Amino acid sequence: GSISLPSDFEHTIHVGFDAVTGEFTGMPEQWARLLQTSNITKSEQK
Amino acid sequence: MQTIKCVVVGDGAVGKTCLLISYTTNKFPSEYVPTVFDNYAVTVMIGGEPYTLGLFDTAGLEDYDRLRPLSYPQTDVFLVCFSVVSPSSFENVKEKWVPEITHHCPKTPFLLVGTQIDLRDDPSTIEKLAKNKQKPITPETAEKLARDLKAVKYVECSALTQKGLKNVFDEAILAALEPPEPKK
Ligand SMILES: Nc1nc2c(ncn2[C@@H]2O[C@H](COP(=O)(O)OP(=O)(O)NP(=O)(O)O)[C@@H](O)[C@H]2O)c(=O)[nH]1
Numbered sequence: 327g328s329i330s331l332p333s334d335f336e337h338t339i340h341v342g343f344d345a346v347t348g349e350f351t352g353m354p355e356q357w358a359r360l361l362q363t364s365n366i367t368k369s370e371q372k
Numbered sequence: 373m374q375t376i377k378c379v380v381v382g383d384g385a386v387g388k389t390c391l392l393i394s395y396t397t398n399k400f401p402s403e404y405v406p407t408v409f410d411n412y413a414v415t416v417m418i419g420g421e422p423y424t425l426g427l428f429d430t431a432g433l434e435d436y437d438r439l440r441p442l443s444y445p446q447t448d449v450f451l452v453c454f455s456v457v458s459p460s461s462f463e464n465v466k467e468k469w470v471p472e473i474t475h476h477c478p479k480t481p482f483l484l485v486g487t488q489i490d491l492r493d494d495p496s497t498i499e500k501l502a503k504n505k506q507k508p509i510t511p512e513t514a515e516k517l518a519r520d521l522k523a524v525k526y527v528e529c530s531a532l533t534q535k536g537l538k539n540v541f542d543e544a545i546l547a548a549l550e551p552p553e554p555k556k
């Protein structure tokens with residue numbers, strides 16, 4: 327056995343269009359923080 | 373132990389979410405939303421060596437020029453896909469999406485993809501397909517085009533059915549494998 331096809335798979339961060347400020351939503355913790363910081367406006371209310 | 377993150381550029385089945393969806397996890401999309409990034413989980417064992425890959429979706433122009441540093445062109449090989457039957461997208465994706473390959477990876481290889489065996493149905497397509505002298509594009513035709521442009525080479529079919537995705541994965545993970553050298 328050499329190459330094997332992936333088994334696992336799960337939609338971790340689903341980025342979408344954000345009219346709020348011509349930006350995206352649900353921005354990944356890294357993506358968001360990279361430029362912005364809040365995945366969705368204010369990340370999330372823990 | 374080295375990371376593998378293939379970047380994608382384009383729309384209408386570009387290999388980003390379309391591939392992993394069926395070509396990998398099989399399961400189809402869930403929440404319909406402009407895949408600006410979308411994350412995924414996978415582990416390809418090359419020669420018996422677990423790994424952590426992820427299809428990094430992107431564009432390279434529409435609000436991505438700023439969100440590019442997050443994808444880092446050096447991430448790995450480029451994953452691109454394009455319709456098969458519908459030729460209106462074939463030519464386009466070529467001189468339309470390829471140009472972007474440099475926007476996100478001006479010095480990084482790019483892998484093209486063409487699958488659409490279940491989408492086929494529109495008759496008008498064939499009628500025109502005869503005008504382009506391309507004929508009913510198939511899972512093989514896509515490869516031919518890739519040969520002309522010269523790339524990492526790929527081979528695969530459309531969702532639902534499976535002809536042999538393990539192959540394209542061997543070349544998709546091999547090119548990025550980057551045989552580590554004994555450097556101290
Ligand atoms: N097995 C396999 N299926 C493929 C391949 N390329 C595309 N497909 C399938 O053909 C379909 C075309 O892509 P599409 O569904 O438009 O994916 P998308 O571009 O992510 N759009 P959306 O964001 O709405 O889900 C996909 O559902 C995908 O499962 C491939 O190389 N292999």
Ligand SMILES: [Mg+2]
Pocket residue numbers: 388389390407
């Ligand atoms: Mg998608």
